[PDB]
Enzyme design. Structure first.
Site, PDB file in Angstrom:
ATOM      1  CG  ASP A 143      -2.147  -0.925   1.000  1.00 61.57           C
ATOM      2  OD1 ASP A 143      -2.505  -1.212  -0.161  1.00 61.57           O
ATOM      3  OD2 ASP A 143      -2.732  -1.365   2.006  1.00 61.57           O
ATOM      4  CE1 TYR A 145      -8.335  -6.036   3.116  1.00 60.87           C
ATOM      5  CE2 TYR A 145      -9.482  -5.219   5.118  1.00 60.87           C
ATOM      6  CZ  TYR A 145      -9.006  -6.285   4.310  1.00 60.87           C
ATOM      7  OH  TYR A 145      -9.218  -7.604   4.675  1.00 60.87           O
TER       8      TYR A 145
END
Ligand SMILES: [Cu+2]
Ligand SMILES: [Cu+2]
Ligand code: NA
Ligand code: NA
Ligand code: NA
Ligand code: NA
EC number: 1.4.3.21
Lengths: 620, 620
Positions: free
Chosen positions: B290, B374
């Protein structure tokens, strides 16, 4: 009307009168423990019988007794004489603490030791500590306390800053005899004071802290009925209080739609042991069983609004017995309140355009106890999402010694000449499980690594495995943090909508367990503390992991003897006993008063619900 | 005037103009990363030079460039062309996400796969995911994204409830070619919706929650100066923001009497990887970096008062660059506030008669980011007693798949036909240490058990041992929860009043590290995640544990190559890299939106102060 209601002052007064009329409470008798007995299994007949268990000490040397009384029927149910050399001594009485210092003040050996060190006996405080069981044959069957000395320079002085090392005495508190005085050499008494309210030590107080105001304009979201029954955000439970265990949680259940679903029948901290790791003969016997030997509930603090408990606080004031059977109220001994707990769930979705945030909160039930130099907070938390958590908060003043010239492998230095012996603080949580009812089982869950190869050609796969614990002999388990080990308590006869057994997962902190040699006295007396998890079959009389009479008990009582029955625990009425604790190497920052350190555990739903249980939480 | 101030919109506009005038920002160019460079070591000459590092992508296929610009002097310092097959591709651009779905909608193979499943192409969302490096030789040196499909029944539908399993496509986003479409078989698309705002799913919302009002009538206790400099309860620090790392903490120091004492020079989360453990070829390539691939700062949420951040909130609104070099403000992207944190210290002393209670508080610095399904909250905490803590909060919607008939060892079932593959969320904290200055060292501390015998006759003693890490080759360490393992960062040249080196102790949560086979692609690209602790010698260019260009990099970059230099780290300028993470076996309760789960670490003083640092806290 609830059988789980707190003991009343009237109940305790009736117990006193029943004991006195039966001839069991003469002037030589003392109540060392008094508590209500829980309903036996199968109380669905409404035939309530409020029964109390009483331990009665005799200050003249006669055998003590264990007595059960029915307040409902006004009768003694049973009274058994105890052979304490066999089954253990009764818990320590508050009134025996002061006996130790007074007896030593007139003992020629003690006075000689203080004179060699130029200490005024009027300034010497003696910490009266439990004795354990070691090599002294004359102690079998006698009530012994051991004393360590500290100097108090003036009435408001912190004596803990001035340990008198090299000196220990043993005292028979019934016969009022000093059995042994041991003096291994003169150590300098550390001279710096530890007075944490002295402006010369604190400096000017900060003026920088602005107030934080926490209020509930419409009152709290929980209700209290029947004195101690709590309903809060679909949770339902009863808050008990016992003089030995402290706060006990009963009948923890969750309202899922139209069903009240049980989760835990009874939750408590059933023992706590503080073993010291200094091999000096002055302290190598030192082990506190705060719950079993001292009774943590009787030293509960009155909690002050705005200082100890902040916010919209609801108090319970439990009633206990004093040593003569008079009721005594612990005013504001239990705090209850709800707390904001940050974000509960959040998602911003690009495709749907929906932004969603919900906040979490928890219900807090807490008390604080003080035993000598240490102060311990016990906190139970219930969360909106079904999580249950316990947290112990350790603070107070560390136990001190001299710091030897040339250093030590077992003692930290805190100030010039001032040491703090290494030690642990280990707790046992007893969880009488009732996941959707009483047919429960425990599985051990480990992460499983997989090797790259056929069916895993990129070497990315991983899995998990669950092992059912089927009998008590295989239900003594160790932590394994590296394999992510957890334990699942499930109900094989109750399935969620995916046809999987409902369950709860226990998450441990995976701290070290008891460090003492397995051949030591403390390893035998605190065997529970050598393993992270035990599962037993429920039985009425298996209440404490250390047995009923911990004080001066030779060892092996409690969990090691229970599990020898090797009972079936696969889909049965079971009890989980979880050991957890702090290993304390004192730091300079712990002196002269220690900032809080914490340890605990939690249980989270694991397929207990059919989906997230907090979808109906509003936007706030 | 501070060199650590946040980038301004004016600075970013000047960078744009400098790049454009230098011929580096034509219509075919895109800014994939832009950030301020920290001052080099030895900035005590006040000669400030605000420099920006820029990664420039070319949408026509020309080689990308790394460029450094001085805003102060208005010049390009350096511009190097990148060979991406060698050193890695640039981070993924937001504008490339939508390219994937649009390109697949006109590809005959994709359309054929959707037709076999009776799905309308207009309803099919494609999650565009990073590609990694696997067996496909044609991908070397090309920018590839892989796409997985989900059905959106209507514009406000949660597509995550409707995965289209058995289907994956790979797309070259520069040449606009679909390289491969893989269809391994038709799975039923799970039919239940997951719309957590639908009243048919939530039921009636609770009316039982009463408000909790948190206010600060006199304002907060911290001050903010120079835009991002914080002073709070003796702490001093600068709050930075970088589009890759997110919130960065600079110059963390503590005012101890008259001295400002440094503790941490720079603290950040320098990488985070989400590896999936499903061996299906549809998902066995799936690994999110990420931070390194997507840049978590550019997806930071605007945080809403009363919902995301509760209390007396002070916001920062950092400025980043868009892909064309225009400044873009993330309004209210960083929350700062103080929070009550319970009891700080408490003791009721029998001998002195003094009752003492003090309350704790913490300073909170937080942001939230959203990457696809997410959502992650990053929380930094400073406590009154010198403790520093980080906490990551994971929520959002779990990534889904079909649940195979006959079950799976690598996927949880969440709803009928709906699965959730096992995965981890692993973070790397980069801590550029400065304990009382830059001469630091790391020691590993283990508990030591002792055997009963001479000098330990009662078998109660225990101790600890410390091992100094002297060179980088020996500074790759694993957790050992069973031995209570911690790491101490100390300054051998700075001693407390007991003549002991001052230090801070790192307490890990001891969660499992990367589970993938060590021969896997992800183990090579995320080598940092295979060990709990790394220590390196500081160097300007060693910024990320995975290297500068993580996207489609073949492996080995970052920490394994840094530590091969085997540099001296014993009393030197060092950097600690701590791996920590969550292993997620999804539960039914995680669906349809996941309650927060957390992981983190903390650092506590260890003989840093000469006594407790909170004696001057007032009674409140
Ligand atoms: Cu301690
Ligand atoms: Cu997850
Ligand atoms: Na015995
Ligand atoms: Na049970
Ligand atoms: Na390469
Ligand atoms: Na450093």
């Amino acid at each position: 009307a609830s059988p789980f209601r707190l003991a009343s002052a009237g109940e305790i007064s009736e117990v006193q009168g029943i004991l006195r009329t039966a001839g069991l409470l003469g002037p030589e008798k003392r109540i060392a423990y008094l508590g209500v007995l829980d309903p036996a299994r199968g109380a669905g007949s409404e035939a309530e019988d409020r029964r109390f268990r009483v331990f009665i000490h005799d200050v003249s040397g006669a055998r003590p007794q264990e007595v059960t009384v029915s307040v409902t029927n006004g009768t003694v149910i049973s009274a058994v004489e105890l052979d304490t050399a066999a089954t253990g001594e009764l818990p320590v009485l508050e009134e025996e603490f002061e006996v130790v210092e007074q007896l030593l003040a007139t003992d020629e050996r003690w006075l000689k030791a203080l004179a060699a060190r130029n200490l005024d006996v009027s300034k010497v405080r003696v910490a009266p500590l439990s004795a354990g069981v070691f090599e002294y044959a004359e102690e079998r069957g006698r009530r012994i306390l051991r004393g360590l000395a500290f100097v108090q320079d003036f009435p408001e002085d912190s004596a803990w800053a001035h340990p008198v090392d090299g000196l220990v005495a043993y005292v028979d508190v019934v016969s009022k005899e000093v059995t042994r005085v041991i003096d291994t050499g003169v150590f300098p008494v550390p001279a710096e004071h530890g007075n944490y309210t002295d402006p010369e030590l604190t400096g000017p107080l900060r003026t920088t802290q602005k107030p934080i105001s926490i209020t509930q304009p419409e009152g709290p979201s929980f209700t209290v009925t029947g004195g101690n029954h709590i309903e809060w955000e679909k949770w339902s439970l009863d808050v008990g209080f016992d003089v030995r265990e402290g706060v006990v949680l009963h009948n923890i259940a969750f309202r899922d739609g139209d069903r009240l679903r049980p989760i835990i029948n009874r939750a408590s901290i059933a023992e706590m042991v503080v073993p010291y790791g200094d091999p000096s003969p002055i302290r190598s016997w030192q082990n506190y069983f705060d719950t079993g030997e001292y009774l943590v509930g009787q030293y509960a603090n009155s909690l002050e609004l705005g200082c100890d408990c902040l916010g919209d606080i609801t108090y319970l004031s439990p009633v206990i017995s004093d040593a003569f059977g008079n009721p005594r109220e612990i005013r504001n001994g239990i705090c209850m309140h709800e707390e904001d707990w940050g974000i509960l769930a959040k998602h911003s979705d690009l495709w749907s355009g929906i932004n969603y945030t919900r906040r979490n909160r928890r219900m807090v039930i807490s008390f604080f106890t003080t035993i000598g130099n240490y102060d311990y907070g016990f906190y139970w938390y219930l969360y909106l999402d079904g999580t249950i958590e316990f947290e112990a908060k350790a603070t107070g003043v560390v136990f001190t010694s001299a710091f030897p010239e040339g250093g030590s492998d077992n003692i930290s230095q805190l100030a010039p000449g001032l040491g703090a012996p290494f030690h642990q603080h280990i707790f046992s949580a007893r969880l009488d499980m009732a996941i959707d009812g009483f047919t429960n089982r425990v599985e051990e869950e480990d992460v499983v690594r997989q090797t790259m190869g056929p069916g895993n050609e990129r070497g990315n796969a991983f899995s998990r495995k669950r092992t059912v614990l089927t009998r008590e002999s295989e239900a003594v388990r160790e932590a394994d943090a590296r394999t992510g080990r957890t334990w699942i308590i499930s109900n094989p006869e109750s399935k969620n909508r995916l046809n999987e057994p409902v369950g709860y997962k226990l998450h441990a902190h995976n701290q070290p367990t008891l460090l003492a040699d397995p051949g030591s006295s403390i390893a035998r007396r605190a065997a529970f503390a050598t393993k992270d998890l035990w599962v037993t079959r429920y039985a009425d009389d298996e209440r404490y992991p250390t047995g009923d009479f911990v004080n001066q008990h030779s060892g092996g009582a409690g969990l090691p003897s229970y599990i020898a029955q090797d009972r079936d625990i696969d889909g049965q009425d079971i009890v989980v006993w979880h050991t957890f604790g702090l290993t304390h190497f004192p730091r300079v920052e712990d002196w002269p008063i220690m900032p809080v350190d914490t340890v605990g555990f939690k249980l989270r739903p694991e397929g207990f619900f059919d989906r997230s249980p907090v979808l109906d939480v509003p936007a706030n």
